[PDB]
Symmetry: T
Subunit: 154 residues, 12 copies
């Protein structure tokens, strides 16, 4: 059916998003700078590692549904909807970019969970339901770095 | 049992209640901290909070080991505690200052309460306070450092 | 709004976890009799599982751009579970625990439905996972109240 | 309610299926042979152990719902709908049988999750939703062994 | 033949013993799930712990057959046909569960001593050793269970 | 000094008490019976193991003070002040005996800490101060088993 | 034209990008492998993939330690890499053949790049390549064995 | 007196031997001295700990045979046939004493294994058969310390 | 037991120890030289079973010391004492497996015989050592034999 | 002030831990003879226990609103233990170690009393705990100097 | 002097440097202050710990070459070329000092690796080659703290 | 190239040396005696285990270079240049022999690293460079046992 095919389409996009989001996190991990270096270097590795784990989950979900994941490295940027990071960025800009990307993924996961549910694919709906919570945690952490008036440094 | 044994038991109830409120305060700071120091402070509050947390059971069970009862009814904690339960929206600086003030109260009380235990010949309870107070002194030091200025990088 | 309603549920659920945990600590400390070690452990074990839910429920509020309950004075004002009061027999502790678990189980089913209606799949999932632990705890506790084992009842 | 009684009926069937499926896996583990022995001996133990873990989960779910699990050993083959393995089998046949049984369980778990959901039993629906993904993984692994044209041995 | 009979007999013992381990394990799970009353946590754990030790024996006994160029019991429908332990039936009190477990353990202990002797006669030192090791676990389980049935502790009996 | 030789006398008695108390616990561990078997079997092993750890601590404290511990096995019952367990006992009797012995040890450790303090032996005072809290825990646990009116079995 | 910092940094960018592409290739093989060798090969590809994966951070952070920058923009990886990104449906034999070819390219480049680093006096970078190349040599050996025939059991 | 009663008699003696042998090892551990101190302090603790583990095994074996272990602390020296260590000893003398006691236990375990075998008690025979190998290891280690002509210190 | 018989148990331990050393080295050969589409699976099999044989070397050697004897120790002595066939020349994977089975069968036979000898000597510990170790060899033999079976329906 | 008397003790004690640790490293590296492995290990093990005290003693100063010794040039100015000098026999190393441990034990007893009189129960406790480790080390070392073992002395 | 005695000279200097650099890190760990306290307290301990591990490696390298390491505590400041930290410093100053010392050590390790290589001492060359990379990591981390324009706090 | 095939010859010799050196260490482990027994029994096992690990590294290096390791057990003593231990030895003689063999291996590893470097085989050069350091450690340890004038036992 087209709903089942639709589910496979969501998994490819979601998987590609996980790959690009992970690579973005590595960029921030490597290129972060300033007095917050150790803290942020760690933040980006930690949240990056959680996104990383999703790559294999989303890819193998396609296989479990008798489909194929994205696999050719050249295909990732063709199917991803997350923005691949480009150019020199300030730490503030890295965090802003990460939040925007997380918000896109969160919106997509809710949409994709609904598609899976309509397809009767309770497993894929559950996968998205679990993974979206990690994104919501990442978004919260990142947003806090952007708050001011802490009375110590902002 | 004796009047002095009852006084030791009274100290344990107050100290236990303080550990509970102090823990819950740390959770507030953990959850509500914000700004560019978020990850570092989020962890700090969880780490120190966890160390205070461990004291709850130690102080409570000490009462039992002395043939008494700990504070146990949730409604009693705020009636017995002498530390200030955190109230309202706070800046991170305010959280840290509040934590220091509460730690200083606990430090003072633990020194007083160790002396009461010692007077009662209760070497175990005196030892408990003597060990735990050192953790409070560590927490106080960490927190006070966050309030220092002139680091040359961000203050 | 359904989204504001979700946040309201999280505050109540979080406060319930805190009170439920503190209740378990009371049972842990005050249990007595020939079943002491077994029950002392039971109360700690189930207490520890309830404890873990406090942070989960609190941080869920933050992830939804809200705030958790945080002021210690607010917990007993928001909680719907009964905070334990006065001297209790072991049987009474267990009965109280079951009643509170049953309230939480009912509320988590209600609150999962509210989250689902709001489209908040994550919060619905949180309640769906946590309620199973409460259902386990309820079963364990209920078994202690059964009679006719042929050994001691 | 009658729906809640229905949920308990599903749990007994599902639990019994877990037991029979596990014992089937042990058969394959023990009786597998040929040049793929170590690889398949391990596969059958690994997937068998994941099915095994489900036995206690499905049984205790009945208790948490104020019911009783299947418990009398004589009752398992009376309640289970999966095919208990019978007779001497080739490795190919073992894999084919396993896939068929997994597909039956997958079908049943989707049906049973919907029954639980209609009963308002979110916990049981979730249990089936989580467990079915493990079955889907097992099915995919097994199906891969049956593919040909790898260019090395088939 | 006279040459192969003892080894054939050893294989027969392993199938029975393996089948007994499976039924005994499943019995333990019944007790684990269905136990009740003020001893719940303690006994819930006991049944799981002893059940887990019996469980481990299933693969040991099954693979022993393979190591002797035979085959274990494997078809699920065969287990109850080959087992000599009583598969648990019906609603039981906790006392009844314990008594049933003891009786089954005693049957297995007797059989393992008999089967060790058969293996020893066959010159099968490995299989005799397997039974010799496993029977001690059954003896431990039997002792634990029997203690629960003692009275006059002064606290609850 | 004389007070230093007095401290050494306390350590020999305390060490011997730990040995006898440990062996008493092993008796209770082995000979406990009835419907509380697993729980009490574990209790006696757990508390026994904590008493056990004290043997080496108390023995080596003597060496650290340029003295010698009790060492000849025949000496332990000559030096110990705790009652070595004798004869067939009910579980209730075992627990009552254990409590009485713990209370003797608790009393002695307070006395012996005072003796150490008077001698300026802060280390030995500290040893007793730490160990006595474990005895107080053990006493509490044991006393609880003797309480009645739980509403379930007493 | 360029500083010796720059030539070494150029090598690290290419090597880092190669590690990323090689890793993603291994994931393709991991996911798309099939046939009676599935479990064995599924594991092989994950294991060797994981070892290549670990190199990404090492090679990237080496650039930072040399006061340079790694490749970081995801769009840049395929523009800098010299290994062939895997394309289209492949048999298992073809996956293994492709992997060997890519490993051989990397092994050649790492020897060249170690020499460049050594000439620049960059003993650390030379050492990094010297260590990493041995893992590639192991992977190549493993892969090559799968292509051998005449085992007497299945080939 | 049946050979089953005889088996129980052997277990009580062997259990008591384990207790006394362990306490002897503790004496050697505490009282060793000289330039070999750390090495021998560790040896005595290591071999002592392996003997220690036998105490519970031998005691609980009695229980599994529907008997009772030695349990009253005052009974151990009455039942044991190993020599309890007496008086100040040189390190050489401690080692010689340990070897002699190990050789007694080794002899007894062979005798006791035969008694168990004659009783049809395959489990108890096995216990002695396993434990005796540990004693044989200990004996070997100890005997090596007594050898001369190493060319470094003897 | 007579001196002759005690010496005979010691002789069995030397042979058994030397066999463990050669069997181990044989397994390393198979580990290193295995090839073909089963490479990873067999590379691991040979290492796993080799590692279990390896562990036996120290057990069998130290058993001699515990009996007031000496193990084989001079490297030149191993091939003089061992009765298992040291692997020789280029072999197919099938040939490696066949060789391993034959050697395991020899060791299994010897361990049963040597357990009898130890039992006759009253040496219950040595009899036990052989009784335990032979089961590992029986497991290894089973695993290896399975690789030689045909008609799996997938690759044979 | 009495606050500064306690702080004075902590600086001396901290400096002593640093010097004592470095001494242990010398013994670890320079020990020789047929007891090599055993002594190499002994010196590392006891050295490691002394090492752990450095941070405890330094941070205690910070917890009392003071500062620890920190400038590396200050350690030998503040320490009262003898820094090891020149080539030594193994016997001499052990003798030197015992002497320094005895000095530290004496000082910790004195310094515990100073803290107790200042009402600084935490600092008194620190010294009370650490001195027991020194007492253990002293015992171990002294045993190596005993004779008449019947095997090698 | 011979190339061999030259290598030993380098190890003494390098070892002494490791000791002084470690003690400097402890100063920074203890005396750091301000709103970055936890992050920097940890950084200094982490990098300090990695420098610490080098002390034994460099010292024992001397022994392996039939020489002797620096060992007299009074010798460290006489042999080390790194600047021992002196006086009250701001956090910025601590980081600047650490970078300068790491840069000194990095330069020296490259020089000393070349000396070892010329001596044919491949082991010592390798030791320096490995250790210098840790210093290069530490230098990078520290330099990042000194960067400005992150958009959050600088 | 000619240097390339030469590298393979070095690996065969080195691998064979690791096997013989390991078997030598086992001899010393088993046959060591006297009052230093535990210490030396451990030393020989510890250093033996480190030599043991080199066997697989050196063998598989040959495979990674498209060659073959030594593998026929009969070939080891034909290819090894280290002296296989022969006859009854004093502990002193065991240590002296071990040192001589280590010195041969250290010499050869330096020579073989140079050969690999000439061949452009940076991996094999590195392997030798790493392994030689372990041999240098073992040599140092062993040499220390031969020193006299410790003031305690020599
Ligand atoms: Cl952190
Ligand atoms: Cl438990
Ligand atoms: Cl595997
Ligand atoms: Cl050691």
């Amino acid at each position: 059916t087209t709903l089942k095919e639709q589910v496979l389409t969501t998994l490819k996009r979601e998987q590609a998003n996980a790959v690009v989001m992970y690579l973005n996190y590595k960029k921030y991990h490597w290129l972060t700078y300033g007095p917050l270096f150790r803290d942020l270097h760690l933040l980006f590795e930690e949240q990056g590692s959680e996104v990383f784990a999703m790559i294999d989950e989303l890819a193998e979900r396609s296989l479990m549904l008798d489909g194929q994941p994205v696999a050719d490295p050249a295909d990732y940027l063709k199917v991803a909807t997350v923005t691949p990071s480009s150019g020199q960025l300030t730490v503030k800009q890295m965090i802003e970019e990460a939040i925007a990307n997380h918000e896109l993924i969160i919106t997509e996961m809710h949409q994709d969970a609904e598609i899976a549910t309509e397809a009767g694919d309770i497993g894929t709906a559950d996968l998205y339901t679990r993974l979206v919570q990690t994104h919501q945690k990442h978004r919260w952490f990142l947003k806090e770095f952007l708050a001011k008036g802490d009375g110590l440094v902002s």
